[PDB]
Ligand binder design. Structure first.
Ligand code: HEM
Ligand SMILES: COc1ccc(O)c(OC)c1
Length: 137
Protein backbone atom coordinates (compact mmCIF):
# COMPACT_ATOMS: atom_id res chain seq x y z
CA UNK A 1 0.00 0.00 0.00
CA UNK A 2 0.87 3.70 0.29
CA UNK A 3 3.38 3.33 3.18
CA UNK A 4 5.21 0.50 1.43
CA UNK A 5 5.25 2.61 -1.77
CA UNK A 6 7.12 5.34 0.09
CA UNK A 7 9.66 2.66 1.16
CA UNK A 8 9.96 1.37 -2.46
CA UNK A 9 10.46 4.85 -3.81
CA UNK A 10 12.95 5.82 -1.12
CA UNK A 11 14.88 2.59 -1.84
CA UNK A 12 15.91 3.95 -5.23
CA UNK A 13 14.99 7.58 -4.82
CA UNK A 14 17.07 9.35 -7.51
CA UNK A 15 16.13 6.76 -10.18
CA UNK A 16 12.43 7.03 -9.47
CA UNK A 17 12.61 10.86 -9.13
CA UNK A 18 14.10 10.97 -12.58
CA UNK A 19 11.62 8.57 -14.19
CA UNK A 20 8.68 10.46 -12.73
CA UNK A 21 9.85 14.04 -13.44
CA UNK A 22 10.52 13.03 -17.05
CA UNK A 23 7.07 11.42 -17.30
CA UNK A 24 5.64 14.73 -16.12
CA UNK A 25 7.61 16.94 -18.51
CA UNK A 26 6.89 14.63 -21.47
CA UNK A 27 3.15 14.46 -20.69
CA UNK A 28 2.86 18.22 -20.20
CA UNK A 29 5.42 19.90 -22.43
CA UNK A 30 4.07 23.42 -21.55
CA UNK A 31 5.13 22.74 -17.96
CA UNK A 32 8.80 22.96 -19.01
CA UNK A 33 8.05 27.07 -18.99
CA UNK A 34 8.88 26.57 -15.25
CA UNK A 35 12.15 24.69 -15.97
CA UNK A 36 13.83 26.83 -18.58
CA UNK A 37 17.31 25.19 -18.08
CA UNK A 38 16.01 21.74 -19.05
CA UNK A 39 14.66 22.89 -22.47
CA UNK A 40 15.94 21.25 -25.60
CA UNK A 41 17.30 18.04 -24.04
CA UNK A 42 16.24 14.42 -24.42
CA UNK A 43 15.61 12.17 -21.41
CA UNK A 44 19.05 10.61 -21.46
CA UNK A 45 20.67 14.04 -22.00
CA UNK A 46 18.85 15.33 -18.87
CA UNK A 47 19.89 12.24 -16.83
CA UNK A 48 23.56 12.72 -17.78
CA UNK A 49 23.59 16.12 -15.97
CA UNK A 50 24.48 15.85 -12.30
CA UNK A 51 22.29 18.89 -11.62
CA UNK A 52 19.20 17.09 -12.94
CA UNK A 53 19.70 14.09 -10.66
CA UNK A 54 20.51 16.35 -7.70
CA UNK A 55 17.43 18.55 -8.21
CA UNK A 56 15.03 15.66 -8.83
CA UNK A 57 16.31 13.57 -5.85
CA UNK A 58 15.92 16.86 -3.44
CA UNK A 59 12.37 17.36 -4.74
CA UNK A 60 11.39 13.71 -4.36
CA UNK A 61 12.93 13.54 -0.87
CA UNK A 62 10.59 16.37 0.31
CA UNK A 63 7.72 14.73 -1.50
CA UNK A 64 8.33 11.49 0.36
CA UNK A 65 8.63 13.37 3.74
CA UNK A 66 5.20 14.97 3.03
CA UNK A 67 3.72 11.63 2.03
CA UNK A 68 5.14 9.86 5.09
CA UNK A 69 3.73 12.59 7.39
CA UNK A 70 0.28 12.35 5.81
CA UNK A 71 -2.60 10.52 7.55
CA UNK A 72 -4.84 8.38 5.33
CA UNK A 73 -3.30 10.19 2.29
CA UNK A 74 -4.17 13.64 3.69
CA UNK A 75 -1.08 15.76 4.00
CA UNK A 76 -0.47 18.09 6.93
CA UNK A 77 -1.56 21.67 6.44
CA UNK A 78 1.91 22.75 7.64
CA UNK A 79 3.56 20.76 4.83
CA UNK A 80 1.14 22.36 2.35
CA UNK A 81 2.13 25.76 3.66
CA UNK A 82 5.80 24.93 3.27
CA UNK A 83 5.22 24.09 -0.41
CA UNK A 84 3.16 27.28 -0.98
CA UNK A 85 5.72 29.55 0.72
CA UNK A 86 8.90 28.16 -0.88
CA UNK A 87 10.56 30.91 -2.97
CA UNK A 88 11.02 28.29 -5.75
CA UNK A 89 7.20 27.84 -6.02
CA UNK A 90 6.30 31.57 -6.24
CA UNK A 91 4.24 31.75 -9.48
CA UNK A 92 2.67 28.26 -9.23
CA UNK A 93 -0.94 27.33 -9.06
CA UNK A 94 -2.62 24.13 -7.92
CA UNK A 95 -2.98 23.00 -11.53
CA UNK A 96 0.80 22.57 -11.72
CA UNK A 97 0.54 20.07 -8.83
CA UNK A 98 -2.53 18.33 -10.26
CA UNK A 99 -0.57 17.64 -13.47
CA UNK A 100 2.45 16.32 -11.55
CA UNK A 101 0.24 13.85 -9.68
CA UNK A 102 -1.65 12.76 -12.80
CA UNK A 103 1.81 11.96 -14.43
CA UNK A 104 2.99 10.20 -11.24
CA UNK A 105 -0.11 7.98 -11.10
CA UNK A 106 0.11 7.18 -14.81
CA UNK A 107 3.80 6.22 -14.31
CA UNK A 108 2.79 3.90 -11.45
CA UNK A 109 0.00 2.22 -13.40
CA UNK A 110 2.44 1.55 -16.33
CA UNK A 111 5.29 0.20 -14.15
CA UNK A 112 5.52 -3.59 -13.66
CA UNK A 113 4.93 -3.03 -9.98
CA UNK A 114 2.32 -3.23 -7.28
CA UNK A 115 2.11 0.48 -6.39
CA UNK A 116 -1.15 1.52 -4.73
CA UNK A 117 -1.88 3.96 -7.58
CA UNK A 118 -5.38 4.82 -6.27
CA UNK A 119 -3.83 5.98 -2.97
CA UNK A 120 -1.40 8.22 -4.82
CA UNK A 121 -4.20 9.70 -6.99
CA UNK A 122 -6.21 10.48 -3.61
CA UNK A 123 -2.97 11.91 -2.06
CA UNK A 124 -2.51 14.21 -5.04
CA UNK A 125 -6.13 15.46 -4.87
CA UNK A 126 -5.85 16.01 -1.10
CA UNK A 127 -2.53 17.76 -1.56
CA UNK A 128 -4.10 20.07 -4.19
CA UNK A 129 -6.96 20.79 -1.72
CA UNK A 130 -4.45 21.54 1.06
CA UNK A 131 -2.38 23.79 -1.18
CA UNK A 132 -5.49 25.83 -1.95
CA UNK A 133 -6.35 26.05 1.79
CA UNK A 134 -2.72 27.20 2.44
CA UNK A 135 -3.15 30.05 -0.07
CA UNK A 136 -2.12 28.75 -3.49
CA UNK A 137 -4.25 30.09 -6.39
C1 HEM B 1 4.79 17.78 -3.82
C2 HEM B 1 5.34 18.37 -4.89
C3 HEM B 1 6.61 19.12 -4.85
C4 HEM B 1 7.68 19.13 -3.97
C5 HEM B 1 7.86 18.23 -2.77
C6 HEM B 1 8.62 20.12 -4.41
C7 HEM B 1 9.83 20.38 -3.75
C8 HEM B 1 10.82 21.21 -4.25
C9 HEM B 1 12.14 21.31 -3.73
C10 HEM B 1 12.68 20.61 -2.50
C11 HEM B 1 12.81 22.19 -4.53
C12 HEM B 1 14.26 22.62 -4.38
C13 HEM B 1 15.21 21.59 -4.99
C14 HEM B 1 16.64 21.99 -4.72
O1 HEM B 1 17.11 23.06 -5.18
O2 HEM B 1 17.40 21.27 -4.05
C15 HEM B 1 11.91 22.61 -5.56
C16 HEM B 1 12.27 23.51 -6.59
C17 HEM B 1 11.37 23.85 -7.61
N1 HEM B 1 10.10 23.39 -7.79
FE1 HEM B 1 9.12 22.15 -6.64
N2 HEM B 1 8.12 20.68 -5.52
C18 HEM B 1 6.95 20.15 -5.84
C19 HEM B 1 6.13 20.43 -6.94
C20 HEM B 1 6.42 21.36 -7.91
C21 HEM B 1 5.63 21.57 -9.09
C22 HEM B 1 4.31 20.90 -9.37
C23 HEM B 1 6.31 22.57 -9.83
C24 HEM B 1 5.98 23.13 -11.17
C25 HEM B 1 5.18 22.50 -12.03
C26 HEM B 1 7.49 22.91 -9.11
C27 HEM B 1 8.43 23.82 -9.55
C28 HEM B 1 9.67 24.00 -8.91
C29 HEM B 1 10.70 24.88 -9.49
C30 HEM B 1 10.59 25.72 -10.74
C31 HEM B 1 11.77 24.79 -8.69
C32 HEM B 1 13.08 25.52 -8.88
C33 HEM B 1 13.87 24.83 -9.99
C34 HEM B 1 15.35 25.09 -9.88
O3 HEM B 1 15.74 26.17 -9.43
O4 HEM B 1 16.20 24.23 -10.23
N3 HEM B 1 7.52 22.13 -7.98
N4 HEM B 1 10.71 21.95 -5.40
C1 LIG C 1 9.93 13.77 -8.78
O1 LIG C 1 9.13 14.80 -9.36
C2 LIG C 1 9.70 16.01 -9.60
C3 LIG C 1 11.06 16.27 -9.62
C4 LIG C 1 11.51 17.55 -9.87
C5 LIG C 1 10.61 18.58 -10.09
O2 LIG C 1 11.05 19.85 -10.30
C6 LIG C 1 9.24 18.32 -10.07
O3 LIG C 1 8.45 19.41 -10.32
C7 LIG C 1 7.18 19.17 -10.91
C8 LIG C 1 8.79 17.04 -9.81
Amino acid sequence: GFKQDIATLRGDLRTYAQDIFLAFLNKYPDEKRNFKNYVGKSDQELKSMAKFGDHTEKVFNLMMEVADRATDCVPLASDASTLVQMKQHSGLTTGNFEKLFVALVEYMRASGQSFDSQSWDRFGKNLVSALSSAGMK
